Write a protein that binds this DNA or RNA. Structure first.
Ligand SMILES: [Mg+2]
Ligand SMILES: [Mg+2]
Ligand SMILES: [Mg+2]
Ligand SMILES: [Mg+2]
Ligand SMILES: [Mg+2]
Ligand SMILES: [Mg+2]
Ligand SMILES: [Mg+2]
Ligand SMILES: [Mg+2]
Ligand SMILES: [Mg+2]
Ligand SMILES: [Mg+2]
Ligand SMILES: [Mg+2]
Ligand SMILES: [Mg+2]
Ligand SMILES: [Mg+2]
Ligand SMILES: [Zn+2]
Lengths: 136, 177, 60, 115, 84
RNA sequence: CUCAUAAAGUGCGUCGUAGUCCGGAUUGGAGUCUGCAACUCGACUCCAUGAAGUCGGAAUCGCUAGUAAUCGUGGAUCAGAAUGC
RNA sequence: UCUCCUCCUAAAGAGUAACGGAGGAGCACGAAGGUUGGCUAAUCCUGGUCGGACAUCAGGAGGUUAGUGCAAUGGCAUAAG
């Protein structure tokens, strides 16, 4: 479960998630799972997808996680009246814009990479596609 | 003045022949000699720092600067601005006379003397050595001492490299081992 | 040089038992009698086995 | 005044002043004074400079101070590097010449170390 | 120690084995029970297995190290320390 | 006949209260004797070094006269090896 | 919690709310004020008696990563240090 070791501040504003993403190319490995929809990726979701990939490939090849959940999300408990302070931090998300290469993989044939990325795309909450490294 | 005249008449010629220089200004000079005493037990007895100042003054023939702490240190329980050492800087005539006193008298009086390390250059040609017992200087009489002390000596030189610095000191016949 | 704060620094004579006489300005005041100098120290001048001792003690 | 790199006592007699050297005892001090032709009850303060010079010559004939210290250290290190029984005893800091270690042995074993 | 006039002591069987080893080169270690024999200059560079009570300890005889005893060289008491 | 000069004492000089000219443990080197052989594991000699120790907590012991204290000597055992008897 | 200061929210002038997110103040100083003259930091590496990861000394690298009587912001080399 990914989380920053320390941050300057514990709570952040909600903010907005407009625009299209940077880091949209396959940079290190040969194949990539790229997000086409827009949303948030919980650290639990990222972990579940990574576990599914690594188990599908059986620990050959190399896997890069190109996103990191650095934004804390708060929640209020039940039976708490609205308005008495910002709530407590519960989990961390990574905001995703379209075209954002979430995961990336090398050292494995294309069909096995496609199958592993299919299992992880089934674990993720947003729309994805499979992309290949292109020379320029 | 004796070793300074010795410098001017033969050491510059020796270094010219040795290193194929083009300028007598390029031939290295001995710039200064700095003597320092770390008297860090002044925090317990400040008066002993005054004793060490009188000691260094008698050795070098010059009143010393009482050096204080640059910044406060946790382990040694010193505060910034607190006097913990003393230092003299020797330039010119007094530097040459003290250098002669050292290399002729005080160095042969060292207990268990087998020579000075040739690795004691700071990478730039400057030399540093330590004196364990100030009693090696004859200016300090024996039965008037209260505590055995030491000091350290830094010959700062305008030479560019270790080979040049050790060549200069060897041309002055500095007892390297 | 500042006045009145520096120690008295006048020229004296140091004699070493190897017959050496030298003159230096120093702060001790009186003349100096030296046990050794740079001209008679063995390091400066240049004055500084089991099978052998076995053969010497048990020569046959 | 200064013999073999240390300052000998001045108000004591000649034999004690010469045995203050590391490496000179009573017998060697008597040998030094006999070879220098100097009475043993004459103090260093009433000894002249030339007599002190002859004493320096005789002490330099003997082997004292740093030479003796480094010979002893070299021999002990030679044993401990060699690995004989005496070398092992010197390594563990125990009595070497076959003394008992069940009791006593306190000079080599230092102060008592309770459990 | 031994008197100078009596010279250094060495067992005859050990001396003969050393002489044979010298004249026919470096073989396997010289097995011996003579802790009482002193090392001579002639067995320099040789492996001697000295009996110490239950096993034969190998000793590699060299130059700086002659004149002592193989008994000094082979310890007899095994000691690792109390409270272990 | 040998072991086998008893020592404390006595007289003279030095030391002048200091870890010392007290103390003699430890250690390095060089040896002698005995014994087939001194490494584990002997004694003594010489040289070199000079550790703790400056009168000892609670407690505890011996002694009523040639005794306590203090200083030397011999024997048995034994080739050699006593601060024990 | 209630007065005062600093940042953000605050939408590139000002101002701007919530039991919104973070920190401070209720002083100090006759020098820590005035002026004239002078000077430049943090940290690391190398060498050096006790001295050690760290004291004082010498040289280099570095270039304000320091400093500011006390928070934070904005300033500061002509130094405001
Ligand atoms: Mg003796
Ligand atoms: Mg014994
Ligand atoms: Mg003591
Ligand atoms: Mg006393
Ligand atoms: Mg008795
Ligand atoms: Mg008898
Ligand atoms: Mg007997
Ligand atoms: Mg505005
Ligand atoms: Mg606006
Ligand atoms: Mg309004
Ligand atoms: Mg101010
Ligand atoms: Mg100004
Ligand atoms: Mg100002
Ligand atoms: Zn001389």
């Amino acid at each position: 479960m990914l989380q920053p070791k320390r941050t300057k501040f514990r709570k952040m504003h909600k903010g907005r998630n407009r625009g299209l993403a940077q880091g949209t190319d396959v940079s290190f490995g040969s194949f990539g799972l790229k997000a086409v929809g827009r949303g948030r990726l919980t650290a639990r979701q990222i972990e579940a997808a990574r576990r599914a990939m690594t188990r599908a490939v059986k620990r050959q090849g190399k896997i890069w996680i190109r996103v990191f959940p650095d934004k804390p999300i708060t929640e209020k408990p039940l039976a708490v009246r609205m308005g008495k302070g910002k709530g407590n931090v519960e989990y961390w998300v990574a905001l995703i814009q379209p075209g954002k290469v979430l995961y990336e993989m090398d050292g494995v044939p294309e069909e096995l990479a496609r199958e592993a990325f299919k299992l992880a795309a089934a674990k993720l909450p947003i729309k994805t596609t499979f992309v290949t490294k292109t020379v320029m | 003045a004796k070793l300074h005249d010795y410098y001017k008449d033969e050491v510059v010629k020796k270094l010219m022949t040795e290193f194929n220089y083009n300028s007598v200004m390029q031939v290295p000079r001995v710039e200064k000699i700095t003597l320092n005493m770390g008297v860090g037990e002044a925090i317990a007895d400040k008066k002993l720092l005054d004793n060490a100042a009188a000691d260094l003054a008698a050795i070098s023939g010059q009143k010393p600067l009482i050096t204080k702490a640059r910044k406060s240190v946790a382990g040694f329980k010193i505060r910034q601005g607190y006097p913990i050492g003393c230092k003299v800087t020797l330039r010119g005539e007094r530097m040459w006379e003290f250098f002669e006193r050292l290399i002729t008298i005080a160095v042969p009086r060292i207990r268990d003397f087998r020579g000075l390390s040739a690795k004691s250059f700071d990478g730039r040609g400057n030399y540093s050595m330590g004196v364990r017992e100030q009693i090696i200087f004859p200016e300090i009489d024996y039965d008037k001492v209260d505590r055995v002390r030491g000091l350290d000596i830094t010959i700062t030189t305008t030479a560019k490299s270790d080979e040049e610095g050790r060549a200069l000191l060897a041309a002055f016949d500095f007892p390297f081992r | 040089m500042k006045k009145d704060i520096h120690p008295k620094y006048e020229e004296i004579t140091a004699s070493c038992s190897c017959g050496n006489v030298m003159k230096i300005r120093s702060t001790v005041g009186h003349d100096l009698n030296l046990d050794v100098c740079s001209k008679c120290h063995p390091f400066f001048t240049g004055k500084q086995g089991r099978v052998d001792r076995f053969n010497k003690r048990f020569n046959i | 005044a200064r013999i073999a790199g240390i300052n000998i006592p001045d108000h004591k007699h000649a034999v004690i002043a010469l045995t203050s050297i590391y490496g000179v005892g009573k017998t060697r001090s008597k040998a030094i004074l006999a070879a220098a032709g100097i009475a043993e009850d004459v103090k260093i303060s009433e000894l002249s400079e030339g007599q002190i010079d002859t004493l320096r010559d005789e002490v330099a004939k003997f082997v004292v101070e740093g030479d003796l210290r480094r010979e002893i250290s070299m021999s002990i290190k030679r044993l401990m590097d060699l690995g004989c029984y005496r070398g092992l005893r010197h390594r563990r800091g125990l009595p070497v010449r076959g003394q008992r270690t069940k009791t006593n042995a306190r000079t080599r074993k230092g102060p008592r170390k309770p459990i | 120690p031994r008197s100078l006039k009596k010279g250094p002591f060495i067992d005859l069987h050990l001396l003969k084995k050393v002489e044979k080893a010298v004249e026919s080169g470096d073989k396997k270690p010289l097995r011996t029970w003579s802790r009482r024999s002193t090392i001579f200059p002639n067995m320099i560079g040789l492996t001697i297995a000295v009996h110490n009570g239950r096993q034969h300890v190998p000793v590699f005889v060299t130059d700086e190290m002659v004149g002592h005893k193989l008994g000094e060289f082979a310890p007899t008491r095994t000691y690792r320390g109390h409270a272990a």
